[PDB]
Design a protein around this nucleic acid. Structure first.
Lengths: 146, 320, 216, 146, 320, 320
DNA sequence: CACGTTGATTTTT
DNA sequence: ACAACAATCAACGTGA
């Protein structure tokens, strides 16, 4: 089971470490999938004229740029600990970078065959995967005591 | 120009085709961000980039088949209604409902673009398309845009909760080019002026017509032949070779390169070619068709004759 | 003789060299009496039997079956099979209907048994095939549907009576026609598909001729 | 296992545990077997390399992001006032995940041998029998409950 | 090139075949979304992946049996009409109705592709063909596309309520390959140019030809022989094994692999082989056949003499 | 191999059986949708699934008697015409009409496969053949395909009325395998090369050859014998039991399983076995026979000798 | 024992 | 549309 059971965690569980919209707000599908949306866009929008690690580091550059528009209630790595900005921002940036190691070297590189067309006809479907996975984890974490 | 070509066509629509094809070879350039979708994503396919050079695998957008025939077709029906040859009111004898039991079996739309009902019968289209492919790769020919849907209050909240009406949509960029060949089987001169009229006079394509999808169809050639020429894809692949894999070049340059590729390819097809209208002769033909469609009496005459020809076809060979 | 002179004959040439082929078919399986009546209709280029032919060829099937348990069971089954779908479907023979229109539910039952993988259960076939019968019936015109056309009773009870009438017919096809008679084997059903269909058309016309008399 | 046959009654009862409409409303065939229609679409559409649980999370979300697009009259879990609304969902998405495992394991895997060509040829029958089983159970239930 | 092969053909159609088979080995490459169907789904079957090394089972698409003889046949009939050898008008002395009693029983289609209805008898096809299989697996070779039919108002709900006509269809992807061996039994040289004409000149296959289903026939060899060579499935399986299952390869390299598999398989067949036109000899053959079909004065003579030969066969050995 | 095998055969054809059977053990694998019919459906029969273990009943397809001898017979006749040893023109002294008066009564077909029409007697087939059975059940081994026939206008109507030309036919799936033993009595060595030639050189079998029914004959053994070995059904029931009914195995494993069950069964037959050509000796012999059928001089000589042998049998013991 | 020879019937709505 | 088969299976007379 492991090789894609761990992906059915990591596809949301590796972004839950830096991004969590509270599901009780009943927020949009777009608002929950925001990390993955901007990873799959980085992965569809360029040819292999630069490395998989260059795709990881530039894509990390997108999410750390985009999430400065979201309100700080979305970012558990800022909410849930009390430490200096330039160090929590480094913890944020490297948590974003490891999430894109899943997105580039396992989700794109293995599961989407490593070919952008086979991702593109699936992007709504692997989005609906993350949509269910985020709720499957978070609503258990909130409500399992009932 | 057109005065000479009247001799190439049938004098009335034949029972069965007799190899009098006319092929329209055109580049369809995007304006205003089109959407070509079926299952909620832009249609794309993995493809070979070129023919001889440029052997690498490449994802390219596809304008899937009906999405280029039916905008043309409906713009034709609109002109038939405007000239008063057909009607939309259910009390009229010359009504033509688009797709249903109430559809006509004798107007130019029905006999050229085809129809099926069941009871009355059916008629195979005389205009032949195929799905058309982006000359460029998909990665460099698309962008996805967010849309939101607030209240008139200028907000996403009405009771202090959010309404959550936000999503994104995948759009084709402007100046993305789809090479296409449209083909017509055993038409009359008037049937030719009708379908060519549609190609030139139709501007909006794909989803969200009301907001997007304007396209600049540059006709590159017209070729009269005993049979079928190359696919849309073979023209796209031959053109990516001649474009050297470096598609970031002007629209006029891309049009003249397509005329040179079309003529290089036509010489490799096992079909006779009665005429090949390209270059200055096509700009002369296009201008003589633009004169027809701007002149009210002449357009009414030509397209009126077509109605008679299609009524004759219907009463002699068609669904009676 | 009156069955051999209907089929395996020509109008000036009785072909009595084929009477051994006509008898062996009648004895092997009694529904061949209706397969031969259909061949005679084909030669005579006539699209339907006369009212006389519908009781003649049936009294012949009842005569040649008279001593045999499996033939009397198959001839009783082919009547029961049609008498069951005639509870929920009735094309009126006066309108000159096709052999296909008469056999709409039986053709959609047999195609279901033959098209599904051999692994699937009888109690799955009964549900998938009754779905296809419901789907087909709802595409015909309302006058052909005895339970739904009768406005006298509440709509959910017309739906409930239709669903259980479709279920009992489909249960007879899958249990008794396929499971018991055809040994639960699709090869043995495929050989019989043609003579089951011919026997059901003659059964439908007989049940209709009997109804239009006894309704007085 | 013996689940290689006789599935449809278990398949429909598993979604009747979370989605319903009464035949007194006289609804369209497409609306009754909506849960199964999203399941068969997910199975047939995504790449053939992907494993059972990855099909399940995707298929579960692919119908959850569609059943909430219509009236709560059709959702016999979220309407139960006996439970707090955030815990109604904890029952609901675990009901979806068990319906979705029986279609990926019993239906696709066992009954169609895991071959997409076999499932695609028989899709309309696998639909029509679940539509009929749904009507059969719904118009039975109203008899015994009175 | 063709000047040397005229020696190998029969001088007129023989009564019984005398073992002079011409085989056309070709790859039918998908260009745009064909629909190969019977019973409402893409026809698909399980096969061994390849002959000796890759021995796992693999579901592959099937271009079922007629689906590659009818487009060829009908492109041939349309040329006979275009040259005026046959006619569609029910009053003419040279009428040939397709699929009917009024078949000519003496034109080239009738003699080469056969006929069956009526008192004048039947004739077996001299073109031999078999169902053809995708080189790749079905799961990697198809996609299903949904389609709808709005009212011309641009809505789905003209009655105030929906049409509910939304459905989907399964389509074979572009660049999917079907290996094929067409065969021709005891023809004349003009019969060879007619059948090779059809295979090279026909372009549309499967359902929805007026909208979809263009293909690219790459002839990879012509093999003159004393008998039947390999089945389409055996060419498919040998070629899959030769590529090791890594089928994501350029179109030309797939044609060069097919040519080098076919020559190694022919060396294992118990047939004397009079000629084996491959590579540069096939490039130089096909350009010479193109320059028949591109020239009116040559084509009308050749297909004209075929009329005579076939009319003669009809009046000496055939239907009279 | 051929240099030793030569000793086992008789030096000329006898009038009476002198023992000396040669048994050709084959698997006939379907390659392209065979139709094996009489009375309008695929021929099938109920059988025990296998000899000892799996003793339940099962319906299996029947490749009925002549469906596996007329292909062989006719393929040998077109070779005799190709080599010029027989002719199809009336008024030639070496005419051989198939199944009529005007059968030669001297050619290898007439002697090896027999004749019975008209004056000059009747001759028993020296090739003994039997009906073959599918190794698997009917249910796993067939499919029904709809076929239709529109007007050439591309629709099922010519005057608004329907054609309704729609029907099903059943075809055997690819990779369906038919185990069989062909047997040859009292041959000369050249007669063995002719019959074995037919078995390796034929490739179409069923109905609709022109479109369908290619098969791959893998010869799995050749057994020289004092009398009849097992039936086709018995080899089938042994092979199903040895696989346990697990029939989804590749053709190489299936041909190797047939080889070991045939040798197990042969050691239980009351038959002196002079030679038992299997495996590495058989794939030697099959190549030494391919070397005959690919060589114009060797084949003409051998089959010409046969003609003399069969013409001398005819003048000495046969039709005079 | 082994050579040689060559005509006839009347019809199945 | 269209075929249901196709052939062959003595009866003497005359001389040695």
């Amino acid at each position: 089971m492991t090789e894609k059971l761990k992906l059915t965690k990591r596809l949301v569980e590796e972004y839950r470490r830096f991004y969590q919209v509270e599901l009780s707000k009943k927020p949009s599908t777009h608002a929950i999938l925001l990390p993955l949306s901007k990873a799959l866009e980085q992965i569809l929008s360029v040819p292999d004229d630069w490395d998989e690690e260059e795709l990881i580091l530039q894509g990390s550059g997108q999410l750390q740029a985009a999430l400065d528009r979201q309100e700080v209630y979305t970012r558990p790595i800022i909410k849930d600990k009390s430490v200096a900005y330039e160090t929590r921002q480094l913890q944020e940036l490297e948590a974003i970078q490891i999430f894109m190691t899943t997105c580039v070297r396992d989700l794109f590189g293995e599961m989407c065959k490593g070919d952008r067309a086979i991702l593109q006809e699936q992007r709504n479907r692997i989005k609906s995967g993350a949509e269910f996975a985020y709720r499957l984890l978070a609503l258990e974490a909130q409500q399992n005591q009932n | 120009m057109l005065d000479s070509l009247k001799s190439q066509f049938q004098p009335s629509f034949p029972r069965l085709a007799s190899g009098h094809y006319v092929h329209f070879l055109m580049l369809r350039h995007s304006q205003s961000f089109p959407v070509f979708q079926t299952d909620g994503v832009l249609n794309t396919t993995r493809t070979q980039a070129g023919l001889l050079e440029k052997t690498d695998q490449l994802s390219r957008l596809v304008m899937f088949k009906r999405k280029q025939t039916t905008p043309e077709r409906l713009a034709g029906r609109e002109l038939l209604r405007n000239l008063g040859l057909t009607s939309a009111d259910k009390s009229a004898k010359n009504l033509c409902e688009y797709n249903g039991e109430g559809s006509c079996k004798q107007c130019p739309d029905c006999i050229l673009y085809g129809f099926a009902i069941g009871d009355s019968g059916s008629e195979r289209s005389k205009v032949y398309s195929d799905s058309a492919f982006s000359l460029g790769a998909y990665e460099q020919s698309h962008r996805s845009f967010t849309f939101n849907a607030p209240f008139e209050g200028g907000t996403m909240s009405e009771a202090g909760v959010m309404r959550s009406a936000i999503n994104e949509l995948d759009h084709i960029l402007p100046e993305v080019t789809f090479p296409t060949v449209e083909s017509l089987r055993d038409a009359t001169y008037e049937g030719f002026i009708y379908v060519l009229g549609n190609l030139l006079r139709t501007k909006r394509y794909g989803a969200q017509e009301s907001r997007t999808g304007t396209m600049k169809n540059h006709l590159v050639g017209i070729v009269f032949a005993d049979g079928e020429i190359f696919s849309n894809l073979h023209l796209t692949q031959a053109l990516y070779d001649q474009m050297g894999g470096e598609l970031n070049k002007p629209i006029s340059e891309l049009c003249e390169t397509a005329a040179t590729v079309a003529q290089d390819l036509l010489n490799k097809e096992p079909v006779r070619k009665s005429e090949l209208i390209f270059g200055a002769h096509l700009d002369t033909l296009l201008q003589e068709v633009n004169d027809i469609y701007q002149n009210d009496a002449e357009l009414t005459k030509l397209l009126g004759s077509l109605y008679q020809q299609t009524q004759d076809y219907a009463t002699e060979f068609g669904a009676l | 003789y009156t069955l051999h002179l209907a089929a395996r004959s020509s109008p000036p040439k009785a072909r009595w060299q084929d009477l051994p082929k006509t008898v062996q078919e009648v004895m092997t399986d009694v529904l061949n009496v209706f397969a031969l009546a259909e061949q005679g209709l084909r030669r005579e280029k006539r699209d339907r039997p006369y009212e006389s032919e519908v009781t003649e060829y049936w009294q012949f099937a009842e005569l040649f079956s008279q001593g045999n348990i499996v033939m009397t069971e198959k001839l009783k089954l082919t009547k029961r099979l049609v008498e069951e779908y005639r509870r929920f479907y009735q094309v009126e023979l006066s309108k000159k209907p096709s052999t296909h229109a008469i056999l709409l539910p039986l053709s959609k039952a047999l195609e279901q048994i033959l098209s599904v993988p051999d692994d699937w259960d009888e109690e799955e076939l009964i549900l998938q095939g009754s779905g296809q019968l419901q789907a087909a019936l709802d595409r015909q015109e309302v006058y052909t549907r005895p339970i739904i056309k009768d406005k006298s009773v509440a709509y959910e009870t017309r739906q409930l009576q239709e669903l259980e009438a479709i279920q009992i017919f489909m249960t007879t096809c899958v249990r008794d026609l396929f499971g018991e008679m055809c040994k639960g084997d699709r090869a043995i059903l495929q050989e019989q598909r043609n003579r089951i269909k011919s026997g059901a058309e003659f059964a439908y016309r007989l049940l209709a001729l009997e109804a239009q008399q006894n309704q007085n």
